[PDB]
Amino acid sequence: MNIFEMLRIDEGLRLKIYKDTEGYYTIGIGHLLTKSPSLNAAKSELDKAIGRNCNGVITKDEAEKLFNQDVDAAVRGILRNAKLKPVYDSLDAVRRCALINMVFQMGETGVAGFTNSLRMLQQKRWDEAAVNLAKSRWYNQTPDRAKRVITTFRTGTWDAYKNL
């Protein structure tokens, strides 16, 4: 299993504009388009992103292209971030995928706000950190997914997705 397969399980794939759990206009594999209420603002962002008139719909290839850009930007974001990099560097390969997953969903800033949990992951206190991560809006809003990520940080294995 790798980061792409992981995120593909958590985000799903949709070829037509859709609303995310938060109500925002998204397309493809979790690619947020705009936080704006206008479906029109959305279609405009989409066309700007693809470089064509899509009229709210894209192909598999286009979805995958946006996906590769998003994972890349998520990784580079972590590496440029002063709160995030040290933690990333301290982790093993599977747990690294869990941090990338959070950054993809909630943005760098959002994850960097989990000060205490980051400190515990760094110190390798798996159980304590899993309990702390669960005390968040994140967990309360998207629990099935948060649980999967949390177990990944907890165990360092892919058990939570070997199911799926």
From Swiss-Prot:
One of its GO terms (cellular component) is host cell cytoplasm. This is Endolysin. One of its GO terms (molecular function) is lysozyme activity. One of its GO terms (biological process) is cell wall macromolecule catabolic process. It comes from Enterobacteria phage T4 (Bacteriophage T4). The keyword Transport does not apply. CDD domains: T4-like_lys. The keyword Iron does not apply. Changing E11N: Loss of 84% of enzymatic activity. Belongs to the glycosyl hydrolase 24 family. Induction: Expressed late in the viral replication. Substrate binds at L32, F104, S117, N132. Endolysin with lysozyme activity that degrades host peptidoglycans and participates with the holin and spanin proteins in the sequential events which lead to the programmed host cell lysis releasing the mature viral particles. Once the holin has permeabilized the host cell membrane, the endolysin can reach the periplasm and break down the peptidoglycan layer. The active site is at E11 (proton donor/acceptor), D20 (proton donor/acceptor). It is an enzyme of class 3 (hydrolase). Changing N132I: 5-fold decrease in enzymatic activity. Gene3D superfamilies: 1.10.530.40. Its EC number is 3.2.1.17.
